[PDB]
Structures are given as structure tokens and as C-alpha cells.
């Protein structure tokens, strides 16, 4: 598998591992998003000290407003972070 | 780094490696997309035998229609593929 193939597969596995803690593995609930954010994204999470931030991220990512994140909504989180990071890498090297 | 962190970083590296063949490393041109598709995504590409398919994918992904893919447009390709793959994994296991 290529690196792109491997990363597509990891995305799927990470979602599934975090979405399968309760009885619905197709949705990440608020509790599961809390755990994902404090363990896969600990570094970004620990910085922020206001606990209302995750509640605000959740609402913002929950596009159909059912209170849970489905795979696609979770991908918009991954993508939003990779875009900010890529913007900083450009900013830092074409300065 | 977590698997999510590593995958965000690989996304950025893959884009940058494929976008940096010509003099613009912030955009993947048509030629570079051709190479990326025949090497990172060879398995999906080789199946299709109609060469007009990539031209049609390119047009579809090129949302601001400047003829090149920027990082975000490239992420919509990665995401569209991970979503179809996750849909097939659900279809196959909740059958």
C-alpha cells in the first residue's frame, strides 16, 4: 500500500475505533469525540484550557445537527486541521 | 505522534512532494495530478481504462477552475475516496 492508501485506511480505522465504543459504530458521540480529542489530538487539546471549546467545535462540526459526528463530519475536522497546518508550513517557508 | 497526527502530516507531505515537481509547490497541475493518480492511487487508476476519466475527475475537483488543484481541493479527493471506502466497509459488515 502507498502512503496515501495507508492514510485513507488509518482514517477509517481511527474513526471506527473511536466510533465503536458505544452501540453505534457509525457515529462519534460527544463523549467519544471528547476521548478522541484528548487522546489522538491531545497536543492541540491540552493547549486550550477552556472546556467550552470542544463543545463549540462539536456544534460547528455537527452539520446535520443530530448531536453526533458521522464519518464525513469527522473528515471535515481532519481536513480543517491539515489545512491550517499546511497554511502555517507555507507561511513559515515562503516568508 | 499519534496515528491521526502522522496521517495529517503524511497528507501534507504527499501533497508537497507531488505539487513540487514544477515551479509552483502550492498547486498540483494536471501533469502532476496524472503522476500522483498513476503512482499513489495506481490501484484505482489502473482499473479504469478510459483516459478521459482523470480529465473528468480533475475538472470536478478544480472548484475555482484555475486548472490546478490546491491543497484543499486535493483533500476533497482524499476525503471522497475515504468516504466511498468507509461506505463499502459498512455495506459489507452490516449486511
Amino acid at each position: 500500500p502507498t502512503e496515501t492508501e495507508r492514510c485513507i485506511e488509518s482514517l477509517i480505522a481511527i474513526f471506527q475505533k473511536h466510533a465503536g465504543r458505544d452501540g453505534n459504530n457509525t457515529k462519534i458521540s460527544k463523549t467519544e469525540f471528547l476521548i478522541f480529542m484528548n487522546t489522538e489530538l491531545a497536543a492541540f487539546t491540552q493547549n486550550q484550557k477552556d472546556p467550552g471549546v470542544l463543545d463549540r467545535m462539536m456544534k460547528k462540526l455537527d452539520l446535520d445537527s443530530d448531536g453526533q459526528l458521522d464519518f464525513q463530519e469527522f473528515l471535515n475536522l481532519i481536513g480543517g486541521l491539515a489545512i491550517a497546518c499546511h497554511d502555517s508550513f507555507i507561511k513559515s517557508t515562503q516568508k | 505522534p499519534t496515528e491521526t497526527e502522522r496521517c495529517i502530516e503524511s497528507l501534507i507531505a504527499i501533497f508537497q512532494k507531488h505539487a513540487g515537481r514544477d515551479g509552483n509547490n502550492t498547486k498540483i497541475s494536471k501533469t502532476e495530478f496524472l503522476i500522483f493518480m498513476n503512482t499513489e492511487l495506481a490501484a484505482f487508476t489502473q482499473n479504469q481504462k478510459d483516459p478521459g476519466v482523470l480529465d473528468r475527475m480533475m475538472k470536478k475537483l478544480d472548484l475555482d477552475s484555475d486548472g490546478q488543484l490546491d491543497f484543499q481541493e486535493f483533500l476533497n479527493l482524499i476525503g471522497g475516496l475515504a468516504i466511498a471506502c468507509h461506505d463499502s466497509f459498512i455495506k459489507s459488515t452490516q449486511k
Binding site: 489530538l41 497536543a43 492541540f44 493547549n47 486550550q48 471549546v53 486541521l81 491550517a84 497546518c85 502555517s88 508550513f89 | 505522534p1 497526527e5 502522522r6 495529517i8 502530516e9 501534507i12
Partner: peptide, 11 residues
Amino acid sequence: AMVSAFLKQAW
């Protein structure tokens, strides 16, 4: 890697 540090700085 670079991402983890970025995440720390951004937000």
C-alpha cells in the same frame, strides 16, 4: 512531528 507542534501553537 511538525503537526503536533503546529497544533500546540495554533488554537
